[PDB]
Amino acid sequence: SAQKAPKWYPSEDVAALKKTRKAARPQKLRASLVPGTVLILLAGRFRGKRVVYLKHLEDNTLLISGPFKVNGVPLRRVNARYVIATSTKVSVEGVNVEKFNVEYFAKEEIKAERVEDQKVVDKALIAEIKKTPLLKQYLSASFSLKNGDKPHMLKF
Amino acid sequence: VEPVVVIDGKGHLVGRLASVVAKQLLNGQKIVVVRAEELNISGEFFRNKLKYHDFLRKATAFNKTRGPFHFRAPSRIFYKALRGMVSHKTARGKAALERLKVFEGIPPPYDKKKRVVVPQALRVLRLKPGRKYTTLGKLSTSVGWKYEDVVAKLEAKRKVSSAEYYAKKRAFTKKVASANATAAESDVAKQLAALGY
């Protein structure tokens, strides 16, 4: 006998988890995030791109669109914490956003059916984009910080 | 904010400018100091000449060649004040000193570049009107610097060349303002003025 014995063997019965009183409540977005607001994406592949805020999905994320015809940003899902909400406003009360949900973006090249959904949504925005002058060129230009720019006093 | 900052040493105080530069060097900002012969020191000329003589007599007794080195150039006098404001015996303090260049007068290419001043180091902005001050170039010559006339001759030649450059620039700037004034009274000029431009 190299080692005699442990005088008491610990029990291998795993105890159940206690009742967790941490029920989940819906997210409270900041007051600057109203649907129709022009957003600036800070992280990701479309960083610096300017998009249009459409819907607040149930997974605490935001449903956005470029539009895809303007700057090449399709119907996409982004987090609210990586987004600077600007002051430019576009009336989103002509759009069918209620169809899109969390299960819509399921991984399971580009699937064909979502292409026409992008074309049926962008037509309802480019109609009003042409109302305010220079908005279409604004939405196709990437945001960037220049020398001397101070974000703590820059009005967005 | 800039890759290399060129500070004009004329009208500055050797101690208040060195403390500004020493902090900038430790933060990783390259500093070039020009015209170190026109630095100012508070107090009369006889005060600073006596203070340097007190420093001059401090040397190692058994070997003068390994004691305190009393540099006479105005650039090195400013360097000595700056060296004691930095922990120069450590690796971090040595790397900070390689980010600094101090010259008498305005040397080459730093003569074709913009020179700045440190507002909290100007003699005119810190000293009471009436206080006596000493010029570093005159003090250095009295303690053994023999290049005051060479720098003054080269500086006079540089100012002639820079005056000719400014005449071309001032004439070109007036031509630019005439075209910018004609750019007014238009649609794009009035729209810019509405947006603060």
């Binding site: 900041r30 600057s32 800070l42 992280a43 960083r47 610096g48 914490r81 990586y82 987004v83 600077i84 909400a85 990437s142 945001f143 960037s144 910080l145 220049k146 020398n147 001397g148 101070k150 974000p151 703590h152 006093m153 967005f156 | 904010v1 430790l26 933060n27 990783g28 900002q29 971090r92 900070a96």
Partner: protein, 106 residues
Amino acid sequence: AESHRLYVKGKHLSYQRSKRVNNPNVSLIKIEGVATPQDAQFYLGKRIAYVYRASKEVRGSKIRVMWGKVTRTHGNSGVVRATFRNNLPAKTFGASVRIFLYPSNI
């Protein structure tokens, strides 16, 4: 365009320290353009990344990144305190560092 910068440049000054004792767990960062603690309040919680070059090829690139965050202000001149996932090598005193705009509160 000519510039694609979505961050603000900062400088690693030193660790949180007393006269003779330092704490490497907290680093002091000087953000350019900031000179008051009130302006430094905007940068609280913003993500900090230090970009440096290495020699050995790791994942098809010679650039390794050390991440951190702004925790609180420090002093009356806009200096902020920073805690990284791993402490800075202390050889970067005066090296440039990047402070991003996310997580954004605007």
